[PDB]
Symmetry: D2
Subunit: 388 residues, 4 copies
Amino acid sequence: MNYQPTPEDRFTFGLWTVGWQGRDPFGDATRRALDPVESVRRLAELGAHGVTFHDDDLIPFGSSDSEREEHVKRFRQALDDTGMKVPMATTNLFTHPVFKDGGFTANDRDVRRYALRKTIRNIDLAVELGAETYVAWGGREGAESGGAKDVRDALDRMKEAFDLLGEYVTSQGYDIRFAIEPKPNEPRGDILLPTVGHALAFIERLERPELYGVNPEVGHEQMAGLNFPHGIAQALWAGKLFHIDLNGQNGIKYDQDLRFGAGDLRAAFWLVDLLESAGYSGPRHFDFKPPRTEDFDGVWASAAGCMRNYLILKERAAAFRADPEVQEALRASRLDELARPTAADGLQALLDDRSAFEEFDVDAAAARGMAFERLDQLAMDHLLGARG
Amino acid sequence: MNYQPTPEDRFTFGLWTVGWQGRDPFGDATRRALDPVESVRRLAELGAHGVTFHDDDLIPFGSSDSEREEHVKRFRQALDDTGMKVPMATTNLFTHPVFKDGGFTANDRDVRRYALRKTIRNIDLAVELGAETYVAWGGREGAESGGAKDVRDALDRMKEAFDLLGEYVTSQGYDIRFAIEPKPNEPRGDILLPTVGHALAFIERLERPELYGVNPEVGHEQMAGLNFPHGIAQALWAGKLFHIDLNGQNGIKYDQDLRFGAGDLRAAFWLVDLLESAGYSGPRHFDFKPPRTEDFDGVWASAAGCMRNYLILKERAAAFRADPEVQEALRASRLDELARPTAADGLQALLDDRSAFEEFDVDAAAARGMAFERLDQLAMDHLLGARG
Amino acid sequence: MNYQPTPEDRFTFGLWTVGWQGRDPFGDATRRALDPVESVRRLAELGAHGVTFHDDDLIPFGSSDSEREEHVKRFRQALDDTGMKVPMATTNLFTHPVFKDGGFTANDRDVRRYALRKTIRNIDLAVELGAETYVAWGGREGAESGGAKDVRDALDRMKEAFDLLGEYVTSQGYDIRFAIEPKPNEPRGDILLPTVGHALAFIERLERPELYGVNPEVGHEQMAGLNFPHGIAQALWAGKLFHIDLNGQNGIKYDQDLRFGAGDLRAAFWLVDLLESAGYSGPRHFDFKPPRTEDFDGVWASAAGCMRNYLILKERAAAFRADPEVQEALRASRLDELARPTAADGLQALLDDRSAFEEFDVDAAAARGMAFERLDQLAMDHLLGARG
Amino acid sequence: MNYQPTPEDRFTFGLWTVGWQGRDPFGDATRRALDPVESVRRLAELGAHGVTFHDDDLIPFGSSDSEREEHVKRFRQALDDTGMKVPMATTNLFTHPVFKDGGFTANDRDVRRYALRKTIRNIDLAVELGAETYVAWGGREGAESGGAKDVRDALDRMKEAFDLLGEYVTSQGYDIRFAIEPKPNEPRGDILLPTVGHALAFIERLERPELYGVNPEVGHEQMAGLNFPHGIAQALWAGKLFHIDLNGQNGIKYDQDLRFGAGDLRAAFWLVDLLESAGYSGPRHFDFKPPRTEDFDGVWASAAGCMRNYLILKERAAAFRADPEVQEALRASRLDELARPTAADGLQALLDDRSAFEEFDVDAAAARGMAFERLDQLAMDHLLGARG
């Protein structure tokens, strides 16, 4: 009756996660670098399904086409020896000083062109490795001051970039879709497309909207004090949840990247409840950082905890929905009615329906209790395994 | 060389603003109620262009069709005697206990139908009074707990409601457009369509998207720690800025509704700069609350301050853009290049362009300073009128 | 193996909590008023230990000395019939319009004098009913603008008020201590003594510091994004934790007053762990509001949930500390060393200790892992009852 | 009629400020390192009064006693050639991996002893260079998880450390005082002594409280959503404002370290108003970071802007207080009464004063307007130089 993960659970990790050396804005690294091959081997042993990477994680910046080839080959052999897959890949358009003002929206045009070329080159490699989703996190797209960036022009440049990438994949005949990852701030004072909503609205203005979805991250939405499960529900509603990044965050402050389960525990429960209920079948990707206080043993314990926590919550959420007492409580709170159309009878019928206004007893309706507190306590008991 | 407003400036106020009695969650009212006619007369004298209202502001809840008529007539006479217009109207779907779980997304179906009827009835009246925009603020659409609301079903109910209203105006042949007003939280723990982005994405899923835009509020986006000017830029970019609510907020906390100019002053400057540059021609509506510490004299001084502050900032922003030294600074920071297409030459040309990657000198590009701090200090000097 | 509370658990509730009618800044009441006697009877049945009140909760504002007497008598009989105690009392210096600019720090001197008299009168009554702690929440002490309040003068007025109350209790020979309750904002834009720290520092400037402590509230510190357990640890460290208010809050936003256990669940666990470990023996007081969506059945279910959640967490925290595997993990993370003095040998010895600097192997020390992630996952397993 | 600074203005900068290379958690450095001598020379030319440093800024970590001497000598010559002073110094107890779990509160005892030795060594050097204040920012004192740090034990270790440093300076006969710099979070999940209040309360528990004060930073308090001017007022009230760090922050998010004047402009105005009114005579120290988008020209423009903004605000604040119309407004709002004792007549007199309760006309007092909005608009006009 434990919680051991298997590749069937689709848990994935970025190379940059367990490979984070611990360098923060106020301190040097506390851990030596990991060879991508060792990370692949270590994660496979923990039960992971696959890994993800930024170009610069796999092939050091400025590498020769041959060195590049050696790096890819070694990586490939490790995937072969372990059965690990690579479901997603992304580009590093934030580390090098050249991207200090952005990649796709840098004020310098020559920088923008370079950003597009670097991305296109990695898209080819991502397809080669079997990736189905290509993520784009515009970490440097934004500003610290108001006159430094004209946002309308920036959005034109952002759209131009994404349309060109869409023109490329469709002309190469690749079966890869894009996922935009929003973040409200950090490293820039304010980042463009700050939340899942802004990203979703942006996509509807692209030439080929069908190729783009979102890759929301638990901590990012929480940095704006937003309800993550709700944001995900809207993304699923729009049919745009192509991928998802899981981790923990303790409120509005810098991006902590704690292991999944840490941070807002109740939000994690409602998240798992939703993903499992909605039948999300994409990867359960962890974009986290084992704290710099830890040594390598601590790194792997942190990675294992991510998966363990998701499995415990999945169990608790399933028991919650399957509890007949909860099913009756959901009806007591009228969740069944929320699912029924307000007016399937039509506009005219509604306007002619005296029970809807003229003869509506507003006071009687008002006095009805929603019974939400009883339902929420049942949810609490289930989460804590306190159903007596 | 002062800052006196005239109806030409299009400043408008909600009846509920200067009419706020001062009742908060911890205290009773500190001011007597204002008769809507006195508010109209007082605002006209201050230089306002018009007023806005919720049905329940103009006609007390539960009023008879005749009493209702008397109220409307008196209101009309005042508009006639002062030349004040009514450019926007909205529905109160949050005050009465019956809307405790929402209006359009209440779990109770009968409540949802009642919400739609109450709105439709006020839409007729809004057209009668000359309103061009009908705002919808779903203040009660949301939840305090996770199992109380299935967000996918709620969004279906929300879409159903808006589609029906769109079917109504188009069948009556009204020339009125809708504007959704987002808010992240308060009075509900979490409100649906929490920011401008979520609202924009939602609109693209409606049957007739052209009838809907957004009505963003300065303080609402700031309650999520977001950059208001940026949110507005995206709304303008999408061509969805139908109306706008101005006020002040001091960070992430309860909705303060301070007078415009108060709160984040630099954000207000960049907001006015953008609205004036973009040629926004809609009303400059103030949705604020004169603090409960004030008597009536203080109320009008607060209302007058709203307009005064907008006029001072408009002047400073105009002087900023017109300063040749600022124009050269904008070029030094490459704002001119941000406005130029990244690749008007096309995909193939980009892929064949060696100057874009193979021969791109990343180090030389990286060493270029953006000169953003000099530009921002010029912006500061202009705002403070310290250009020496 | 359930979680039923008994008066031995010292759980208490404010009359204003289960008695909250549901009126918020955007809506009317959804519940009828409760007679204080019914609340006492209902809470006793749930297993509560006692109740608390503001003067204005028990005796309506403006009541005659006789009516006042009738109210107190009825209240007394109910306490007698149920065995319920009244361990704390407080003053309402925030509701009436006269306190719009504060009570003890109102700019108007006559208001300040009135505030002191109203408090003194209720202190006599609190002693009469057996209260041991008198709480002071300066909800109106603060400002929305910078020039409205000179904070140095305000702090002089605040100190003057508290010193006078201290002079009163000591001259009447009462055995009652004061507890200041901080809150960062709401209803004022910014409230004086915004956090537990500011309150603690203030107390050290009073004439008789021994008579004053703090009454921290879970949600208040969380409104400033602070770690509640840490704030409590500092209050205990200083020996100033006289009382405590428990509830739930979901981050930085308006004061939600959710039932205890809701909001930040992990913070609640670490809070209970600390209170039980430290041997806190004061009341476990709930200052919450059953959401306005609920009817009376929902009110009592919410109140019962408060106590249930505290009892489940107490169990989980106890099992955590008692787990030998956790005890070894605490040693692996060097919590035992944190408890040992850094230099009991003294300054001179430290300066002459070459192993402390000259011969200190900084690299070897640096490479030691803290093992915090393993320890935190054990804490997680225990909380979720997932120890396999 | 400009705003040129002179050493008389007491503006100081940390070497680490204009010397920040631009490395953030997501990117490499964008600027080459500055030699401390060039920074001293450059700042002197801008009109600065002096500089400050962390040991590790001046003498590279791991330097030999001789190399150390060469570094100090060169630094000294530059101070001599420019007339620049060094009013404050501090220790770097956060960068090196050995301090990953803290310096004074690290769980490892040997690390704590090493932290104390490193500090003591730099205290000697700070005195040698003429520093009057020694700052302590416990950037690594805290935790990411609840069981990793027992806060009561940590506070004992923190007190032990500070007492030992106090025993050292008093035994060496140094004329140097300490200033604790609070910060709520970053780089640790939660930092001990998170705000000015927690630091002030802590100091009162030290053996020799007179040797310790606070060194508040604009951005730090704003990271907890607190009112900076209010925090400063309380620190001045307690006589503990030994030093102050100025910069800009845009709300609750990562520590931006923008130049002074940027961020919350109105808060900066009220801050300068208070410091100048209170007669603060200590240094006006800038702890900021010129954004990584800038080259060296941009660095110096950013540094110059810090001082320019403080001088403009000082002018506007002075004109505000000197305006007879503002003086009358302050009386209209009863600021004069806030400054008068509530009860200089004493407790007994208050209790016998019928005008204070029995015969107090609460309704008449309640109806008095505070006139705060008019006063705040005058403050606004003055700030914007819009007094017509």
